[PDB]
Amino acid sequence: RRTSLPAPSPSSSNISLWNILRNNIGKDLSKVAMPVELNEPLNTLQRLCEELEYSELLDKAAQIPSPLERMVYVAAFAISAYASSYYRAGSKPFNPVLGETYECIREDKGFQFFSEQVSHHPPISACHAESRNFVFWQDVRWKNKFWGKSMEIVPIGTTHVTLPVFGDHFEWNKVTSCIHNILSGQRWIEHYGEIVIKNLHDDSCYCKVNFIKAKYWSTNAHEIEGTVFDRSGKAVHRLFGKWHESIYCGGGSSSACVWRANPMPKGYEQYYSFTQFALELNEMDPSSKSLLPPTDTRFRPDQRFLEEGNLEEAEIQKQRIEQLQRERRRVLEENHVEHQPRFFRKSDGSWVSNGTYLELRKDLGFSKLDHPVLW
């Protein structure tokens, strides 16, 4: 897999953000159009993919007789979702096209990941991933707004992981993020709220993780404080460390480093500050190009022509795609059509896999009236 990118990143063309944001101080940024040079060659379905860069934590979890330690490893997996945002604090990803998909099949870590863009008004992304040790799925929409100085990220939705060999159902919240000084010199991100991890199927244990807010320069910057309590509210295991750096079991008589962020690629800054994991998800190999629907994001031109350094071709493709989506919003609006997304179905207000993607790839070369062209 390719540890480079066929062009370098725009180091900055963020004068644009100045007028575009201080002219939108309360507005849902999903509703505000922006020049493509402010994007990054990834989208929100792949950014949900990122949440499994450390999936192997789960690969250890279900392999432990102790429930509480399984919780501990889960809490580590949960926090690790935020680690990638330390270096990529600002940049917005591509808003997925309605109906778009993304597929990543990793034999390496042994999971199969698929994702679809299921609604555009509002923007909802649905992801499902299958592994022998866990199934990981969720459903999110972002309420991003820019106040005077800092930019807010508000994920809405919950995250579900099950461990079969133990029948474990872990469910926890996403949490808020202010990016302070997103226009000023040093963008520093900060996470707000409490993550609560519940086992639905196990009453024994529940986990609370808190983000310590501290002045940017404190020695407690980016600190976390976690506990795994029993039913009675008494503390069992404590987690400590920093959410971009390292997490630890223990804290008392003994301790262990349960998680460590991978190190960044060599001179990562010149390629949008991606993790190695990130550089590997809009990279397209020869053998897979004959196995996936034409709605996978690697096909998306403006994305690829930005990965390529062609600002003009990207800016062109992008307006083409967007006005096409207006036309089809309107085409199924006049036919009073409630669009239904392809391999996710809505239940109780969550988009879960209907159970069709993996097996509809199971047989080679699905060219079976590949449902609408998007580019």
Author numbering: 512 to 860, 862 to 887
Give verbatim excerpts from the published study on this entry:
Human ORP3 belongs to the oxysterol-binding protein (OSBP) family of lipid transfer proteins and is involved in lipid trafficking and cell signaling. ORP3 localizes to the ER-PM interfaces and is implicated in lipid transport and focal adhesion dynamics. The ORP3 ORD displays a helix grip β-barrel fold with a deep hydrophobic pocket which is conserved in the OSBP gene family. The ORP3 ORD has a central ligand-binding tunnel with a flexible lid covering the tunnel entrance.
The ligand dependent conformational change is limited to the residues that recognize the PI(4)P head group around the tunnel entrance. Leu516 is accommodated in the hydrophobic pocket formed by helix α6 and the loop β17-α6. In contrast, the lid of Osh4 lacking the upstream residues is completely open and disordered when ligand is absent. The dimer in the asymmetric unit seemed to form by lattice interaction during crystallization process.
